[PDB]
Each structure stands twice: as structure tokens, then as C-alpha cells.
Write an enzyme that holds these catalytic residues in place. Structure first.
Site, PDB file in Angstrom:
ATOM      1  N   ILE A 265      53.187  27.039  99.622  1.00  0.00           N
ATOM      2  CA  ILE A 265      53.798  27.580 101.461  1.00  0.00           C
ATOM      3  C   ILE A 265      53.495  26.579 101.947  1.00  0.00           C
ATOM      4  O   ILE A 265      54.136  25.621 103.203  1.00  0.00           O
ATOM      5  CB  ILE A 265      53.537  28.985 101.440  1.00  0.00           C
ATOM      6  CG1 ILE A 265      54.746  29.388 102.479  1.00  0.00           C
ATOM      7  CG2 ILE A 265      52.052  29.285 102.526  1.00  0.00           C
ATOM      8  CD1 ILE A 265      56.282  29.203 102.811  1.00  0.00           C
ATOM      9  N   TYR A 266      51.774  26.149 102.141  1.00  0.00           N
ATOM     10  CA  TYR A 266      51.526  25.204 103.051  1.00  0.00           C
ATOM     11  C   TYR A 266      52.192  23.640 103.263  1.00  0.00           C
ATOM     12  O   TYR A 266      52.278  23.047 103.730  1.00  0.00           O
ATOM     13  CB  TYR A 266      50.370  25.133 103.224  1.00  0.00           C
ATOM     14  CG  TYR A 266      49.168  26.350 103.924  1.00  0.00           C
ATOM     15  CD1 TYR A 266      48.860  26.318 105.342  1.00  0.00           C
ATOM     16  CD2 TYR A 266      50.211  27.731 103.499  1.00  0.00           C
ATOM     17  CE1 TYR A 266      48.799  27.160 105.809  1.00  0.00           C
ATOM     18  CE2 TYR A 266      49.112  28.772 104.080  1.00  0.00           C
ATOM     19  CZ  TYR A 266      48.492  28.457 105.535  1.00  0.00           C
ATOM     20  OH  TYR A 266      48.056  30.061 106.262  1.00  0.00           O
ATOM     21  N   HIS A 267      52.255  23.669 101.969  1.00  0.00           N
ATOM     22  CA  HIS A 267      52.619  21.708 101.283  1.00  0.00           C
ATOM     23  C   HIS A 267      54.202  22.180 101.559  1.00  0.00           C
ATOM     24  O   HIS A 267      54.567  20.786 101.966  1.00  0.00           O
ATOM     25  CB  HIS A 267      52.735  21.870  99.401  1.00  0.00           C
ATOM     26  CG  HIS A 267      53.605  20.941  99.303  1.00  0.00           C
ATOM     27  ND1 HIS A 267      53.294  19.503  99.109  1.00  0.00           N
ATOM     28  CD2 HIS A 267      54.939  20.772  98.774  1.00  0.00           C
ATOM     29  CE1 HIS A 267      54.669  19.348  98.798  1.00  0.00           C
ATOM     30  NE2 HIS A 267      55.047  20.084  97.683  1.00  0.00           N
ATOM     31  N   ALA A 270      54.152  21.197 105.178  1.00  0.00           N
ATOM     32  CA  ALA A 270      53.629  20.195 105.085  1.00  0.00           C
ATOM     33  C   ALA A 270      54.759  19.253 105.528  1.00  0.00           C
ATOM     34  O   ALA A 270      54.624  17.662 105.972  1.00  0.00           O
ATOM     35  CB  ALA A 270      52.280  19.446 104.651  1.00  0.00           C
ATOM     36  N   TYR A 422      45.108  38.026 105.891  1.00  0.00           N
ATOM     37  CA  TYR A 422      43.355  36.200 106.057  1.00  0.00           C
ATOM     38  C   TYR A 422      42.923  37.519 106.489  1.00  0.00           C
ATOM     39  O   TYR A 422      42.648  38.519 106.529  1.00  0.00           O
ATOM     40  CB  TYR A 422      44.349  35.818 107.215  1.00  0.00           C
ATOM     41  CG  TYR A 422      46.223  35.024 107.091  1.00  0.00           C
ATOM     42  CD1 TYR A 422      45.168  33.935 105.425  1.00  0.00           C
ATOM     43  CD2 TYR A 422      46.536  34.438 107.331  1.00  0.00           C
ATOM     44  CE1 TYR A 422      46.090  33.227 105.372  1.00  0.00           C
ATOM     45  CE2 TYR A 422      47.911  33.452 107.189  1.00  0.00           C
ATOM     46  CZ  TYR A 422      47.233  33.055 105.972  1.00  0.00           C
ATOM     47  OH  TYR A 422      48.500  31.872 105.654  1.00  0.00           O
TER      48      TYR A 422
END
Ligand SMILES: [Ca+2]
Ligand SMILES: [Ca+2]
Length: 636
Positions: A265-267, A270, A422
């Protein structure tokens, strides 16, 4: 309108010919009128670019209630800068210094002037000129009342680079939508252009050295010079943004295209940062300023995402990652297709298989990030395993080397436990630490302890029509290496070989997890587990070890999305390692049709020697023999 009012405009820019003559000849009011005609001309000739925003606005979507509300409240100078509070009245002569609550955030987010875009969209949709008159009134009001270097505290809130960058990004499309209003006087135009210039240039001399802000701020600076290339300084602005983005894409993405956080999900986040930058430039023919390596890298990031995309459009929930909306994901791909029109794979994902062509490959290794995909195909009924044997990540990664998601015939049988939550107070942290446990993932433990690092070395990767083979080794514990091999056989099923190598002794466990509704049978006589789905799409996991091996259930959980969790089956094959001799597990992961689990046994052939990286085994499945003959290591 003065001579000075044109200082920052490049008068020799193509299309500003009349504007040049008028300034040289001394009639500036007509220069301003001529500049206004050029932007009005430019606005009709191209669509507003909203695509750089976190949530890009859609010019042709009908006005929902909150947008209407936001625009109407703004007419009476009520604004809602923060989402944790409602509207406040800032007065009839607006007070931009008002502190209606005691939270810094309310003052910062006020100067993101989010409602200006709302007014823009409502003005576009209705055509009601009262929205335009108020916006021009408000921009001028804001600019005049909040100049840079007004006072220490004002500049702390209005001219903090995060907010400035926000405004330099929102203003171009807002401007584009209001530029044709008769409220948009040529005098205002110049007041706007000089105020914009100051912000974009301030941004160019104040963007962040470190961290999250740096990438956003540089990208928006670039967007400034793309949106208003008529400024003398716009090419420097673009180069500066390009330079920061290019420097960071080299540092943050691997050669295989995966972003270094190792979270799917962070990829994806980005990709948006790096692609939107390039996309916006390409829309007005300034793409040549990006180096080719940047363009390739971004395309490669999309292909890396494609390689780890499951048939439901989800990515495995490794580390801090979660399931996502297919329709929103398709819309992302469709926008990416706009940037890479020649890419058939991207078109295919954009259109759910209706158009384009399936990607040019089946099973693929992303060997830098250590994401390995075994797939039978790209269709909705493919068998797809995505496995993580990575280098180290940071906060959004976990000690899970070996773990995998196995998606068969429209169902995900082995969803990763996921994040759940988190960081927070001690109580919230132990909820999160539970999900970071190695033992709750699909890999080997010693005494159910967390592996101390994910630093996989790839020993072999080879693809084949009816055999794909991965072998890697993880230094999971100081005195215990974990070697795992996965063989994807006949595009159907998997043989999993786990070796615990070194001096350490204790309880070796190879753990497994299943979907919440799979209602499995645990069969301790044959050390096999199998799902009991009514629809006949089922899975067996069976231990094939010769030596004494136990089968036990353990507490299993899965969080698909944030702060929601579901109980689900989990289990482990366990065996003692008493001395320094290596212990080996042979497991089979076997999808099957129907309601009766197949009978599987295994014979060790001559030549089989796991010590020398040599596998030679004959499986027998419901009576039929399958020879498996392969070397497990490469370059040895
Ligand atoms: Ca900053
Ligand atoms: Ca996990």
C-alpha cells in the site's frame, strides 16, 4: 497596473506577444488585459489539472452536499479548516488571525483555504457569478492581509512550507475555473500572479531537507512551473522539483521496481507521488526535462505492483498493508495508462481484462525487495501465491520472512494477519505487537520466537512451464538459519521445503494460517489440514515428514482493514531439534476440487540429498505418481 507588476513574467514566452508590446510601449492596463485574454484562451484550450491532489476533484461530478455547504458558508465567511471541528465565523472583514480553538492545527489548516476549490467547482457547475466575486474578494483579502514578513507568528502559520505547497498546488486549477468570470479583473490577475510567484519561489528556497514533507513540497514546486510556465522562474522551479524527485526515486525504489518500505500500500502511494509529477508535465509537453531513468523506474513500479496484484485486485497484506477498493484501484490504473498509453498490461488492469493484453509473464521474482509471485495466469480463476523473503524494512515491515498469500479460484486461502492498528499507548502497542509476531505468519520459528531480522539471501530462482522454484535462506536467529524452498508444480500446487540449519536446539515450528470462514478439519493421524467449503474450492496442507511430527492449533487472527479483526484458523507442524544436525520439513500445499481431501504420500528416491541441495522425490496423489527432481540451490 505598474511596470513592476510584470517583473516576474517572461514577456518573450510564446503567446505573450501583445503583452510584450504593451509593456514596452508603456500602456500596462492593456498589457494586463492582453495577459488575461491569453490565460482565458489557455483555460478553454485545456482541462484543469487536479490530479496531483491527494483526492483529485472531478470537474464533471455533480455537487454533493458538503461541497455545496462549503461553498455557501464561504459567502458568509464561515470556514471549516479542521475535520475535528465545524464551521467558525471569521467575521465580515475577515480575521485570518482568529484563534477560535486552542489548537495550532486549526490555524495551519485554515491557510490551506480548502473552500476556495469548493467555490470553484460550484461556480463551474451552477455558473452563478456570486461565487467568483467572493473568491476574487477573498484571494485579494488574504494576500493583502497575510504578506510574507508581516510578523513572526503570522508567518509561522501562513508561510509554513507545507501550507504554501498546498496552495501552490490547489490554486492552478482553481484559477483555471474562475479566470473567465467578469469578477476576474486584469488588475486582480496581476495581484494573483505576483502573489502566486512569491509563494512558489518561497517554496523553492524553503522546501524540506528531510522526510515526508520533502517529496510533497518538491513535487508541488514542479507543479507550479508546469502550471504557470510563463514566469521567468518556472524552468528553475521545475528543475528543482525534478532534481529532488529524481534523487529520491533512486534512493527509495529498488531496481526491481519495489519501494523500499516493503509495504504494498505504501508502494502504491509512492507511485502516485512520482507519476503525478511526470504526468502533469507531460500534459503540457515538458516531459523531456525528466531523465529517462526516472520514467522507466516509475513504469517499473507499476509492473512490480502488477506482479504482486492478486485476481481480486488486492495486494498481499504484508507489514502495514490492507485490502483496497477494486474500482478505485482500476481508476488509478486508468490514469496511469494515460501516462503510459503503449503499455498493454497497464491498460489490461485499467479495464479489468476487457482491453489491453495480459502481462508478458507469469511467475516473477522481484529479487531486490524479495517479493516472489507464483501464478498460473492473470484470469479471475488463476492460482496465485505471493511470497515475501525480503531485506530489512522499517516501521511498515514485520519479521515475517517466508510468509505468503495463496489465492485460488476466486478465494484468498491464507490472508496475512495484517496490521489492525498503528502505534499508541501501551495497550494499543500490545495489540500491534501481537500482529508483528513471526509465529502468526506462514514461516518457521524456533521456540515460537520472532526472527531477529529479515535479511533473505536468494539461493535460487527459476521459472518454468510446469515448475517454478524459489530457494532463499534467512538468518532468523543467531545460531539458526532458515532455508525455505517453494516449488510451484504443474501450475497447480506447492511443495514447501523448510530447513533449520545451525547449532541452536529447541522446538521447530512451521506455522500456517487460513481464511476466517474455511472451517478446517485438523487431522492428527495424517498431519494434514483441509478446508470444508460448500462450493468445492478447497485446500489441503499436509506435513510429509518421515520422522515424528505433531500438528496443533493456535490462536489466529486477520485484520482486513483498520481497527477491525476476525478470528481465523491457524496451526503448526512441530518437531524437536535435539542436536546440531539439520532438521528438514517437507510440506505440501494442495488445492483440490470437491469435498474429499486427496490421499498423498511421498517416497524419497535415490539422489535425494537436501544437504547437497538435491531434491528427488516421488509423490503419490490419489494413487497417481508425480516425480519431482530438481536442484534446490544455484551457483554452488
Ligand atoms: Ca516542511
Ligand atoms: Ca503480517
Amino acid at each position: 497596473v505598474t511596470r513592476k507588476d510584470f517583473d516576474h513574467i517572461n514577456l518573450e514566452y510564446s503567446g505573450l506577444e501583445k503583452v510584450n508590446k504593451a509593456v514596452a510601449a508603456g500602456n500596462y492596463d492593456d498589457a494586463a488585459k492582453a495577459l488575461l485574454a491569453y490565460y482565458r484562451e489557455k483555460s478553454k484550450a485545456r482541462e484543469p489539472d487536479f490530479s496531483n491532489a491527494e483526492k483529485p476533484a472531478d470537474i464533471r461530478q455533480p455537487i454533493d452536499k458538503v461541497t455545496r455547504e462549503m461553498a455557501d458558508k464561504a459567502l458568509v465567511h464561515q470556514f471549516q479548516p479542521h475535520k475535528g471541528y465545524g464551521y467558525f465565523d471569521y467575521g465580515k472583514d475577515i480575521n485570518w488571525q482568529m484563534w477560535p480553538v486552542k489548537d495550532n492545527e486549526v490555524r495551519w489548516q485554515l491557510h490551506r483555504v480548502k473552500w476556495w476549490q469548493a467555490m470553484a467547482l460550484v461556480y463551474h457547475a451552477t455558473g452563478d457569478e456570486k461565487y467568483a466575486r467572493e473568491w476574487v474578494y477573498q484571494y485579494s483579502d488574504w494576500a493583502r492581509k497575510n504578506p510574507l514578513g508581516l510578523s513572526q507568528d503570522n508567518d509561522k502559520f501562513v508561510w509554513r512550507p507545507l501550507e504554501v505547497s498546498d496552495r501552490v498546488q490547489s490554486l492552478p486549477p482553481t484559477f483555471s475555473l474562475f479566470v473567465n468570470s467578469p469578477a476576474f479583473t486584469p488588475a486582480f490577475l496581476m495581484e494573483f500572479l505576483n502573489s502566486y510567484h512569491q509563494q512558489a519561489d518561497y517554496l523553492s528556497t524553503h522546501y524540506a531537507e528531510q522526510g515526508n514533507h520533502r517529496l510533497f513540497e518538491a513535487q508541488r514546486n514542479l507543479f507550479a512551473g508546469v502550471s504557470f510556465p510563463e514566469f521567468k522562474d518556472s524552468p528553475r522551479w521545475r528543475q528543482t522539483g525534478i532534481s529532488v524527485l529524481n534523487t529520491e526515486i533512486k534512493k527509495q525504489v529498488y531496481a526491481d521496481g519495489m519501494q523500499f518500505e516493503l509495504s504494498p500500500i505504501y508502494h502504491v502511494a509512492a507511485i502516485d507521488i512520482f507519476l503525478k509529477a511526470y504526468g502533469s508535465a507531460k500534459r503540457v509537453n515538458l516531459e523531456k526535462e525528466f531523465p529517462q531513468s526516472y520514467v522507466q523506474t516509475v513504469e517499473n513500479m507499476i509492473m512490480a505492483l502488477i506482479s504482486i496484484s492478486l485476481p481480486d485486485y488486492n495486494t498481499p497484506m504484508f507489514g502495514d498493508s490492507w485490502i483496497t477498493d477494486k474500482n478505485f484501484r482500476m481508476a488509478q490504473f486508468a490514469s496511469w495508462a494515460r501516462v503510459f498509453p503503449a503499455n498493454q498490461a497497464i491498460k489490461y488492469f485499467a479495464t479489468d481484462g476487457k482491453q489491453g493484453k495480459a502481462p508478458n509473464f507469469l511467475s516473477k521474482a522481484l529479487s531486490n525487495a524479495g517479493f516472489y509471485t507464483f501464478r498460473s495466469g492473470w484470469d479471475k480463476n488463476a492460482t496465485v501465491m505471493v511470497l515475501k523473503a525480503s531485506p530489512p524494512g522499517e516501521f511498515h515491515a514485520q519479521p515475517d520472512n517466508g510468509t505468503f498469500e495463496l489465492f485460488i479460484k476466486g478465494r484468498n486461502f491464507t490472508p496475512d494477519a495484517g496490521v489492525f492498528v498503528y502505534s499508541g499507548d501501551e495497550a494499543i502497542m500490545k495489540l500491534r505487537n501481537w500482529y508483528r509476531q513471526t509465529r502468526i505468519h506462514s514461516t518457521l520459528t524456533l521456540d515460537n520466537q520472532n526472527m531477529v531480522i529479515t535479511k533473505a539471501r536468494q539461493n535460487k530462482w527459476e521459472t518454468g512451464n510446469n515448475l517454478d522454484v524459489l530457494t532463499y535462506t534467512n538468518p532468523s536467529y543467531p545460531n539458526l538459519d532458515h532455508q525455505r524452498s517453494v516449488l510451484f508444480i504443474n501450475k497447480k500446487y506447492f511443495l514447501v521445503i523448510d530447513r533449520a540449519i545451525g547449532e541452536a536446539t529447541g522446538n521447530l515450528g512451521v506455522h500456517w494460517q487460513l481464511k476466517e470462514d474455511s472451517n478446517p478439519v485438523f487431522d492428527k493421524t495424517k498431519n494434514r489440514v483441509y478446508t470444508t467449503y460448500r462450493d468445492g474450492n478447497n485446500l489441503m496442507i499436509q506435513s510429509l515428514n518421515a520422522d515424528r511430527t505433531s500438528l496443533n492449533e493456535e490462536e489466529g487472527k486477520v485484520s482486513y482493514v483498520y481497527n477491525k479483526e476476525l478470528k481465523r484458523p491457524a496451526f503448526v507442524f512441530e518437531k524437536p531439534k535435539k542436536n546440531a544436525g539439520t532438521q528438514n520439513f517437507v510440506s505440501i500445499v494442495y488445492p483440490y476440487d470437491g469435498q474429499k481431501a486427496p490421499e498423498i504420500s511421498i517416497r524419497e528416491n535415490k539422489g535425494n540429498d537436501f544437504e547437497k541441495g538435491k531434491l528427488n522425490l516421488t509423490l503419490t496423489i490419489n494413487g497417481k505418481q508425480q516425480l519431482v527432481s530438481v536442484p534446490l540451490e544455484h551457483h554452488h
